[PDB]
Amino acid sequence: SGHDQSTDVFSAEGRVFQVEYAGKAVDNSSTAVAACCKDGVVVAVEKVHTSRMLEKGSNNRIHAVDRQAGICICGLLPDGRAIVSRARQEAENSRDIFATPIRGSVLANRVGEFMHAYTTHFAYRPFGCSAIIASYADDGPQLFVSDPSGTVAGYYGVALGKAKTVAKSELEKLDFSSLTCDEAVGKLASILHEVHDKQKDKLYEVEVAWVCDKSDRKFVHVPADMVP
Amino acid sequence: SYDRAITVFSPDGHLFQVEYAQEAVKKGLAAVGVLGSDSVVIAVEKKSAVKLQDSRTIRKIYKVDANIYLAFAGLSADARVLINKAQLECQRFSLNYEDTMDVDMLVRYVAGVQQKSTQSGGSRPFGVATVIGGFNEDGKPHLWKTDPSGMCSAWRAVAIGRHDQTVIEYMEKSYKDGMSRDECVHFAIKSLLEVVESGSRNIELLVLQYKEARYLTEEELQKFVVEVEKEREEEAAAK
């Protein structure tokens, strides 16, 4: 019973149940999908709306961390926003202190270090979100995923959330050497429309963002015309 | 530092840690205060004359300032810390306002310290009830009680410690408003004798008058205890 109450405690098997349980919060969350191309990177996230009466752009899961970089949050949105707020703090320390856009690989490691910190101490809990860091700084288009554990990994393509498995099947059909950001916006949104449960989650939209040559290596929401 | 919450509410609205600090006071040696016309008398029971405890006189009624004395019931150690705190406050008060601090003022300070201990994270309450007597500079006599909750009340006569409620129920039957220095001393001993062992040696008692604190000698005292124990024989014959 006491093996899993806090994240400061390994189990006998050698694992940190509170971090696994935080992971479960992401796997029960709305599906997010992303693709790293030559042209840049694209993030599409399904937002499950609880109500018919929300404004367009309510509970935005995708947030600019810097000009060149954006975090899409799959999981508990509020927790996600604490990571966004930190990723921002790190992005602005890179420009304030080192006069450089933070590199994607760096920004990701910094996001993972932060998320991991919360897995080590009895007083805190793990974050309930996987951050998807999309960046196009001097290290090129980079797509990373920090999970609740703090584990960062680079991806060509990546699916998170309750349709993770099926959305990944569809991401494997894409050739990543070939595809452009303009195709990806189409295919990633198409994937999220396909994998979505129509009977369970009636009200939803697909928030897409990118950072590509097209967008001036600036991390922005894609216009509503490309999205379908 | 360690600021875990120790004194907390339970489902029935009780602060268990304060109720248990009062359980520590009930186990404590009986003390008694009696207010007269011109006198305050505080009488306490001692653990009883063991041949080994130093013949040199140790007083179980502590002096907070010239004007103010207190007996306590409960944990000796905790009481010594309160008394040292009260002692310091009285001197902090003479420093900050030329005046000597009134009894009622100090009682409220001591009761405040006891309350803080029931709401400070990291601390248990003081396991101490207090009987504080004395005279304000004006000449009015004051007798107060402070319980571990930090709640303080003034009394005409009071008891703390073991069988406090037996002594108080006994006192409020026999207590008369205007009393002589001798009648107060008589009444205090008579009252303590309700719960304390028949022995005269255990009782030690202090008589406060305006600018005059005197402890009864064990010669002065055994006259009163003989006179009282012959009156407790008179009351045993009646019933």
Binding site: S1, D4, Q5, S6, T7, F17, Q18, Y21, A22, G23, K24, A25, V26, D27, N28, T50, S51, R52, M53, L54, E55, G57, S58, N59, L76, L77, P78, D79, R81, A82, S85, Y118, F122, A123, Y124, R125, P126, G128 | -
Partner: protein, 238 residues
């Protein structure tokens, strides 16, 4: 349940129960309603209805700056704590920039502040829901803040006890709110709120606050003489 005691404990199913429970504080709070039109936001809150000839007042609606205010449901103590924070942050903003804190930026600040409370052991989630209502350059905004730290940009919403009835009413009509006047919005806010009332009790000045904010209208709370213009000549008919 061995997982519902501390805020720092995930359940094995990936739920934070202390947050689900803080949410129950909001749902047992007295009903408030928010509707936004083209140029205006209308908060309408049920107060407690006077028992015989005996009144209670409890400040549930708060001006936060010229251009913003709040309607709370749940632990009124925690409402006051957010009210003070938002007032302090709006003053700071207005001090620096000589203009009202934009509402999108304010929504992000409350979200953030809630989140500080849902992760540390020492802290606890705010047991209060807000309806932020504000007006800036981007026009009128209605946010519903929630203990979880989520912040919902809403066209219309309700909060508190029997508010599923209010949200049902609002869902029939909310599409027509950008076309409505100020007087039709306030009718709609009240008509929604009156769905949330118990059994037989009607809306009136003594049991209903109304607050408005919008284009050229600073955040105003109408009680008594001011509210009567909307509430004397108001009845709820099916």
């Amino acid at each position: 349940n061995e997982y519902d005691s501390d805020i720092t404990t995930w359940s094995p199913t990936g739920r934070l129960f202390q947050i689900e429970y803080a949410n129950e504080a909001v749902n047992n709070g007295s009903a408030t309603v928010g509707v936004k039109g083209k140029n205006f936001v209308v908060l309408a809150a049920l107060k407690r209805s006077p028992v015989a000839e005996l009144s209670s007042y409890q400040e549930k609606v708060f001006e936060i700056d010229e251009h913003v205010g709040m309607s709370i449901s749940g632990l009124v103590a925690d409402g006051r704590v957010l009210a003070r924070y938002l007032r302090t942050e709006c003053m700071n903003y207005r001090y620096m920039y000589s203009n009202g804190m934009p509402m999108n930026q304010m929504a992000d600040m409350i979200g953030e502040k809630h989140q500080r409370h849902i992760q540390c052991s020492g802290k606890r989630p705010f047991g209060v829901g807000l309806l932020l209502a504000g007006y800036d350059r981007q026009g009128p905004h209605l946010y519903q803040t929630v203990p979880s730290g989520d912040v919902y940009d809403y066209k219309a919403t309700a909060m508190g006890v029997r508010s599923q009835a209010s949200r049902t009413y609002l869902e029939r009509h909310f599409e027509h709110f950008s076309d409505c006047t100020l007087d039709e919005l306030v009718t709609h806010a009240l008509k929604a709120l009156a769905s949330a009332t118990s059994e037989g009790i009607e809306l009136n000045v003594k049991n209903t606050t109304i607050a408005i904010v919008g284009k050229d209208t600073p955040f105003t709370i109408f009680e008594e003489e001011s509210a009567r213009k909307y509430l004397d000549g108001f009845k709820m008919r099916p």
